[PDB]
Design an enzyme around this catalytic site. Structure first.
Site, PDB file in Angstrom:
ATOM      1  N   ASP A   1     -14.795  33.358  23.422  1.00  0.00           N
ATOM      2  CA  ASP A   1     -14.440  32.412  24.482  1.00  0.00           C
ATOM      3  C   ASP A   1     -15.272  32.653  25.752  1.00  0.00           C
ATOM      4  O   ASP A   1     -14.927  33.494  26.579  1.00  0.00           O
ATOM      5  CB  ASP A   1     -12.950  32.566  24.785  1.00  0.00           C
ATOM      6  N   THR A   2     -16.378  31.928  25.900  1.00  0.00           N
ATOM      7  CA  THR A   2     -17.228  32.081  27.078  1.00  0.00           C
ATOM      8  C   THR A   2     -16.594  31.546  28.348  1.00  0.00           C
ATOM      9  O   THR A   2     -17.111  31.794  29.447  1.00  0.00           O
ATOM     10  CB  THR A   2     -18.588  31.395  26.906  1.00  0.00           C
ATOM     11  N   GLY A   3     -15.488  30.817  28.208  1.00  0.00           N
ATOM     12  CA  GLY A   3     -14.746  30.341  29.365  1.00  0.00           C
ATOM     13  C   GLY A   3     -13.674  31.298  29.857  1.00  0.00           C
ATOM     14  O   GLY A   3     -12.926  30.983  30.766  1.00  0.00           O
TER      15      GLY A   3
HETATM   16 MG   LIG Z   1     -10.009  28.261  27.765  1.00  0.00          MG
END
Ligand SMILES: [Mg+2]
EC number: 3.4.23.16
Lengths: 99, 99
Positions: B25-27
């Site tokens: 998850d790069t976010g």
């Molecule tokens: Mg997210």
């Protein structure tokens, strides 16, 4: 480009005749951007679900230039806390995770 | 590996003597995993903020094998809806975005 992840992967995007900043977000299925004018027919879409839903407007086949690379796809427009480039457009530009 | 983004980037991880599934998850700034036993001193941490905060336990210097590659770093443990490998550990394994 090759982008490391020490910082949030924020990039400049061109869309709807405007420049904006957005996050390259592999944890997001969809692209969702702050209020702006886009062409074509939209329909409301409920997104989220964890804790509740948020209504956004779904625009299809919108052209975007994400850090220099053009793509066409669906852009949701509505009250997101961060402009998010989700997997739908990451795939269109050929963005992969690599290690 | 090189991972395309047509699907959610779920991978197998080894941690704490267990196998789990988690999202690359790069976010996400931080790695947060479902309840499990980890060694060492922890301290509570409030995460989130958009709509409210969630309390989790912060464990430092935990070994993880993310899709075959080992890394050490901070793992938050608590009531997350999805197991998330965040940027803190993505950087440790040398994961980049590329297009
Ligand atoms: Mg997210």
């Amino acid at each position: 480009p090759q982008i490391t992840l020490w910082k949030r992967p924020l990039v400049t995007i061109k869309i709807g005749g405007q420049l904006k900043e957005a996050l390259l977000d592999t944890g997001a299925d969809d692209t969702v951007l702050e209020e702006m004018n886009l062409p074509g027919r939209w329909k409301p879409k409920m997104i989220g679900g964890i804790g509740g839903f948020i209504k956004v407007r779904q625009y299809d086949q919108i052209l975007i230039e994400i850090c220099g690379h053009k793509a066409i796809g669906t852009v949701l427009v509505g009250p997101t806390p961060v402009n998010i480039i989700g997997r739908n457009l990451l795939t269109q530009i050929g963005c992969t995770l690599n290690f």
